[PDB]
Design an enzyme around this catalytic site. Structure first.
Site, PDB file in Angstrom:
ATOM      1  N   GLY A  21       0.820  -1.244   0.000  1.00 47.60           N
ATOM      2  CA  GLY A  21       0.000   0.000   0.000  1.00 47.60           C
ATOM      3  C   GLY A  21       0.830   1.258   0.000  1.00 47.60           C
ATOM      4  N   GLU A  50       0.625   2.142  12.749  1.00 50.87           N
ATOM      5  CA  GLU A  50      -0.375   1.635  13.694  1.00 50.87           C
ATOM      6  C   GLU A  50       0.364   1.000  14.887  1.00 50.87           C
ATOM      7  OE1 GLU A  50      -3.066  -0.568  10.932  1.00 50.87           O
ATOM      8  OE2 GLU A  50      -4.530   0.973  11.180  1.00 50.87           O
ATOM      9  N   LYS A  56      -1.919   6.471  13.613  1.00 53.69           N
ATOM     10  CA  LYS A  56      -2.880   6.101  14.710  1.00 53.69           C
ATOM     11  C   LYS A  56      -2.081   5.793  15.984  1.00 53.69           C
ATOM     12  CE  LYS A  56      -6.563   4.085  11.919  1.00 53.69           C
ATOM     13  NZ  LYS A  56      -7.406   2.861  11.699  1.00 53.69           N
ATOM     14  N   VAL A  85     -10.005   2.840   7.744  1.00 51.38           N
ATOM     15  CA  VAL A  85     -10.048   3.628   6.542  1.00 51.38           C
ATOM     16  C   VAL A  85      -9.550   2.876   5.348  1.00 51.38           C
ATOM     17  CG1 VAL A  85      -9.901   5.837   7.737  1.00 51.38           C
ATOM     18  CG2 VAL A  85      -7.822   4.658   7.151  1.00 51.38           C
ATOM     19  N   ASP A 102      -6.397  -0.803   1.871  1.00 50.04           N
ATOM     20  CA  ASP A 102      -7.390  -1.721   1.315  1.00 50.04           C
ATOM     21  C   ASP A 102      -8.444  -2.221   2.335  1.00 50.04           C
ATOM     22  OD1 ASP A 102      -5.403  -3.570   2.622  1.00 50.04           O
ATOM     23  OD2 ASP A 102      -6.738  -5.147   1.804  1.00 50.04           O
TER      24      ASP A 102
END
Ligand code: CL
Ligand code: CL
Ligand code: CL
Ligand code: NA
Length: 176
Positions: A47, A101, A129, A151, A157
């Protein structure tokens, strides 16, 4: 599932304009910090490629790129499915992430790259986050701290879909 894809979103958190503005602003800063240095930008597949690609457009100094693919065997232990294709000894490395994360996988990757005798190592993440953190790792460069809600878009994804949106947002709950 909607025929129209934007109809799958509940809320747009970052529009394409917002993301491009972040790339320009981070890119200008990165240009300042890495000008004249042997900069290697490293993306972790899959990603992060969308963000990297747009970010490096705005880094106005010479740089090379590289990619890694890694899997958790989160336990800190990481399996290298595709290593860097080129040497990073004596290079200034920037790892470019779409989202930070737990940090666990990223911490392990930084330890590995640090062992390769880099000049420096920093992280730029589009999204953060911080409430999710499990490992002792923070990014020097952060695009936007966001709520801890799922999200998608712009590399992020759901079930391999939605990475093609040029914006980022939350799905309607009927989608999942
Ligand atoms: Cl992109
Ligand atoms: Cl280079
Ligand atoms: Cl997410
Ligand atoms: Na791009």
């Amino acid at each position: 599932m909607n025929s129209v894809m934007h109809n799958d979103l509940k809320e747009v958190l970052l529009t394409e304009e917002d993301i491009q503005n972040i790339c320009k602003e981070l890119g200008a800063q990165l240009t300042k910090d890495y000008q004249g240095k042997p900069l290697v930008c490293v993306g972790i597949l899959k990603g992060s490629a969308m963000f990297m690609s747009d970010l490096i457009k705005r880094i106005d100094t010479h740089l090379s790129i590289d990619f890694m693919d890694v899997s958790s065997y989160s336990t800190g232990e990481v399996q290298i499915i595709k290593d860097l294709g080129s040497s990073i000894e004596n290079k200034d490395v920037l790892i470019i992430e779409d989202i930070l994360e737990t940090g666990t996988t990223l911490k392990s990757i930084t330890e590995l790259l640090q062992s390769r005798k880099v000049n420096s190592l920093e992280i730029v993440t589009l999204l953060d986050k911080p409430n999710r953190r499990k490992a002792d790792i923070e990014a020097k460069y952060v695009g936007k701290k966001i709520p801890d809600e799922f999200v998608v878009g712009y590399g992020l994804d759901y079930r391999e879909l939605y990475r093609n949106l040029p914006y980022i947002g939350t799905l309607k709950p009927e989608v999942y």
